[PDB]
Each structure stands twice: as structure tokens, then as C-alpha cells.
């Protein structure tokens, strides 16, 4: 029962068993229809946590490796590669759901932006640990997805919509952390932040909490990047 995968997910969330949560929402997604906004939020939180645990581990192992003997430095690399291969499996799973179910079934323009952003993200996460030819593919595919979302975001949503704001936040991180373009990063973020200030008026009760957090984050990032 779908309504039931869904409450397995909610339970797994509460218990902090994010791998269970993701596999449930993956099964819901494979049932082929458009996701409710609540199902879509659960899927996204599930996988953000599942991939973030691994990226965090990957970062820890990598920090240790620089900090450093050979037999040890080698097991550092082997353990990182075990983490890398889980990251690739997590992200491929999500990008396949995006490619086959969520982006094709995405009718409302705010859905297509959300999922194209999600594809930019998971291709960004692949890029953070990719090598050589495959890095260029991942980085290119992440920018394509972000940009396609960032053009629909301007034609269909206001500068205060939390999905438009989140896309600007994450695209700015892509420029800063993946393309290594601090200036393109800091401008994308400032613009989106100023554009939403100059129309704070517009924030429906329902959007207020989320959009303000994202603008706080956009400003926290800009503050940090001018340091």
C-alpha cells in the first residue's frame, strides 16, 4: 500500500533510519505517479540524509588523509573508495528516479524546477568525488540541470518562492565549490537575496518560514565567502 510505504517512511524518519526512509520513498516513486508535495518532501529529505552521511564520512576520511607512512595512507584511500562507491550508488539511484519518473511526470512548473534542482544537486555530489573524463560529464550535467531550472524559475515564480530561492542557494554553491567561481557564486547569491528583499511583500504565510531560512543561508554563505 502506497499510503503505507509513506508511513513506514515517516516512522523511519523519526527513528533516524534514513536508509529505510529512502528505500520506502523510492518504492512510492516507482509506483509511477506524480508525488504529492508531502511525498516529494519526504523523498528529498530521505535522500539528502542518505547521501549527506556518506559525503560527511568522505570528507572526514579525506581530511585524515592529508593530515597523514604508506601502509596507512593506502588504507585511507581504500576506505575512501568504499565510501565513494556508495555515494555513486546513492546518487545513481536518485538520478534514475529523476530521469524516469519524477521529471517526466512533472506537470506543474514548480515541480519541474524542484526535480531539475535535485538533478543538479546529485550530479554535483557525483562531481565532488569523480575523476577525469567522468568528472567533466558530471559537472556539465549538473550545470545543465541547474541552469534549466534557473530559467524556468525566472519565468514562472517570484524571487521569494522557497523553491526558487533554494535553487539559487544550491546553484551558487555549485559555482563556488564545483566550478571554483567565487565571483559567479557570490553574485548569483547576492542577486537572488536582493531580489527577494525588494519584494518581501510577496511572502504568503505558508512560504515565510522556509524562504527566510534560505535567505539567511544565502547571506551566511556570502558572509563566509568574503572572509
Amino acid at each position: 500500500d502506497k499510503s503505507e510505504l509513506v508511513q513506514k517512511a515517516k516512522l523511519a524518519e523519526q527513528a533516524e533510519r534514513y536508509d529505510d526512509m529512502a528505500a520506502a520513498m523510492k518504492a512510492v516513486t516507482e509506483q509511477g505517479h506524480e508525488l504529492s508535495n508531502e511525498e516529494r518532501n519526504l523523498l528529498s529529505v530521505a535522500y539528502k540524509n542518505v547521501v549527506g552521511a556518506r559525503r560527511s564520512s568522505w570528507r572526514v576520511i579525506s581530511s585524515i588523509e592529508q593530515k597523514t607512512n604508506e601502509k596507512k595512507q593506502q588504507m585511507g584511500k581504500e576506505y575512501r573508495e568504499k565510501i565513494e562507491a556508495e555515494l555513486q550508488d546513492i546518487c545513481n539511484d536518485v538520478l534514475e528516479l529523476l530521469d524516469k519518473y519524477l521529471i517526466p511526470n512533472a506537470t506543474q512548473p514548480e515541480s519541474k524546477v524542484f526535480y531539475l534542482k535535485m538533478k543538479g544537486d546529485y550530479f554535483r555530489y557525483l562531481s565532488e568525488v569523480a575523476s577525469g573524463d567522468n568528472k567533466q560529464t558530471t559537472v556539465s550535467n549538473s550545470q545543465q540541470a541547474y541552469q534549466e531550472a534557473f530559467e524556468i524559475s525566472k519565468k514562472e515564480m517570484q524571487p521569494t518562492h522557497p523553491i526558487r530561492l533554494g535553487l539559487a542557494l544550491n546553484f551558487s554553491v555549485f559555482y563556488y565549490e564545483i566550478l571554483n567561481s567565487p565571483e559567479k557564486a557570490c553574485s548569483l547569491a547576492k542577486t537572488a537575496f536582493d531580489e527577494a528583499i525588494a519584494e518581501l511583500d510577496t511572502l504568503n504565510e505558508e512560504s515565510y518560514k522556509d524562504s527566510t531560512l534560505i535567505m539567511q543561508l544565502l547571506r551566511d554563505n556570502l558572509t563566509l565567502w568574503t572572509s
Binding site: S63, L213, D220, W225
Partner: peptide
Amino acid sequence: RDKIRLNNAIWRAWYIQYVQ
């Protein structure tokens, strides 16, 4: 938590420290 701003600052700072 809504340790979100803190955890995000920690995350963005990592890239700065560990990729100069």
C-alpha cells in the same frame, strides 16, 4: 535540528579549509 545555519556554515567552511 534547526542547527541548520550552523551545520551549513560548517559544511561550506570545509571546502574552504580543505581545498585552498
